[model samples]
Target: KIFKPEELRQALMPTLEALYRQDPESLPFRQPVDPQLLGIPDYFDIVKNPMDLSTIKRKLDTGQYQEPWQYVDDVWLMFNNAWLYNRKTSRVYKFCSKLAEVFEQEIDPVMQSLG
Candidate 1:
């Protein structure tokens, strides 16, 4: 079923949408970080490779991902960035962690079929 690019894309969209709706207050990983606006100019310093749901969506629309794993990796990178930059007690950090669990639980079967 995932032999075609569009098929893989279709499989991935549902998981991404689920992540988006997972939390309203934290909706933490929707967009790229704004260094100046957030007053955290050093954000990029810590998070060398930034990723987000909006960026992933844009890449999908523009045909940037060829493999399903590439999509999966970017989603992890988004969570990793938050884990790297935020303290364990931080709300964003906790939110990202919960979302990561949700992602793994939801995407496991989808990836199994693709592989």
Candidate 2:
């Protein structure tokens, strides 16, 4: 099913909120970080950015990161976009990483169940 932008945003709200409230160690599918960070403000920054979605997509398509083991390009794209767009937040990277964990643990499972 194709969700319009607002619909998609609404649909993701709960998960995003959960993610926003998450402790770095409490992530369901991934290991916790040493210095836990990332939260609601970082997400707000992304949402506030006019070009966030486009920038994320572009970075994913371009394979910007050089690390071979870095298979999670979508997460990296989000991180890069957040870092570039919201430079004031030092925890943006951690937030983006948490988002990646959310996608793998939460979003992918729901998609698979539907399929």
Candidate 3:
């Protein structure tokens, strides 16, 4: 199903923002705490770029993001227009590592306290 980027952004905005603004300095966590920084402002930095969809939409528009991986790849390149466009990208590698930065910031007293 195709959806406007705005819709996609909205869907992700909540969790992403929550994670970004998280500051759980509770007891269960030995010394670990949420260190993930990118806040709503950072999110807006991407969505409302002066150029708009900066990477997705290049100066010459863009190409089909068709580098499909059977499984979820960290850097999965979207495919469209017959391998001529990059529709969506999670940038999992960077995101994953960055998220780890937060998860391991404190010292991981309780890995799954939320569970």
Candidate 4:
């Protein structure tokens, strides 16, 4: 089945909102990482690719996604990048790890149906 962009967006927006609500106090995952301002100069060096919820939302709004699973991949990419850059004990790492868990539960069934 050819999935329409609007169809996929409707299916994914709630999952996106659930993930956004899980972000830490400052809402770090809402926007792309700013290594300089965050004071983590080696961020880009460690995290080869970075992603964020805002980017994902923009991509959806722009009709850049052709498949629903593509949205899933971007969500994972954002969390994985955070895990790779931050130590497990760090606050951001812990929060995102839980977010990743929630994502699996919340999005898996949705993608299963979309697929």
Candidate 5:
């Protein structure tokens, strides 16, 4: 069954809250930021493409944006929404891949589709 936007939003709240209450290191697949070791460009890159490791590392280094808790919350919410709305039974990696595919397919057609 397709979940309504409110349903998805509500479903994600608990997960988000859990992250807010937990230590970043204790979370699985969490990306912790160290703003002191990063720069503005790095921050921009991270905000733009958070899944990228380079962006993650850059943000981690700056010690200015060490919001590991926030990042963990966001990732948790994103993954939760993906599961509740799209790939409910899929593995996290597979769910991420499916999300990318859906983004490319529904939002912007891939090169092959265009050609």
Candidate 6:
């Protein structure tokens, strides 16, 4: 409510531009999904905690997700994978795409432990 979008963009642009030089795909990234075949939402009412063993609940008691019941499972996997990828990259030192090995090594054990 305070800073205009342009103002914020101006303030952040230097660092953003530097990051873009280093890795442009980091911020401005997405693959479009068609609403007729599939859908995406501006916001989702169902919330899942990023922590392990956390239980999900309705976001602010909305009682429904942005996507219908049919897409719920796919939505969970897609978004959760993206979230995990970000978490992994953010924590890694001097990251690289080959850092994918870290996900296989770390995430698999955690998932297996739940079995």
- Best by the TM-score measure: 4
Model 5 TM-score, all chains together: 0.28
Consecutive 10-residue window with the lowest summed lDDT within model 6: 51-60
The per-model lDDT (C-alpha) reads: 0.84, 0.42, 0.27, 0.85, 0.37, 0.31
On the 0 to 100 scale, the lDDT of residue 103 in model 1 is 92
Residues 27-107 of candidate 4: C-alpha lDDT, one tens digit per residue: 888889999998999998999889998999999888889988788889989988988888889988888878888888898
Model 6 — TM-score against the truth?
Answer: 0.25
Residue 69 lDDT (model 3): 20
TM-score-wise, the better of 1 and 6 is 1
In terms of lDDT, the best-performing candidate is 4
lDDT of candidate 3 over 1-115, digit per residue (tens): 3434444333323322333443441111112112244232443333321211122223112223222121112111211110222123534233434433553442133222211
Error of 3 at 69 (Å): 13
Give the total clashing residue pairs for model 6.
Answer: 0
The residue-by-residue lDDT of candidate 1 on 1-115, one tens digit each, is 2356677778888888889888652377788888899899999889888998999888776678888888999998888899999999988888998898889998999988777
lDDT tens digits by residue: candidate 6, 55-102: 112221232223222122332443454454444445222232323233
Error of 5 at 102 (Å): 27
Q: Given candidate 1, what's the lDDT at residue 113?
A: 72
Pairs with backbone N, CA or C atoms under 3 Å apart (clashes), candidate 1: none
Q: Please, what is the TM-score per model?
A: 0.91, 0.35, 0.24, 0.92, 0.28, 0.25
Q: What are the runs in model 5 whose C-alpha is more than 4 Å off?
A: 24-48, 51-115
Ranking by lDDT: 4, 1, 2, 5, 6, 3
| Candidates 2 and 6 compared by TM-score, better number | 2
Q: How far off is residue 45 in model 3, in Å?
A: 29
Off by over 4 Å in 2: 1-13, 23-80, 83-89
Cα lDDT over the full model 6: 0.31
- Going through the candidates in order, what is the number of backbone clashes in each? 0, 0, 12, 0, 14, 0
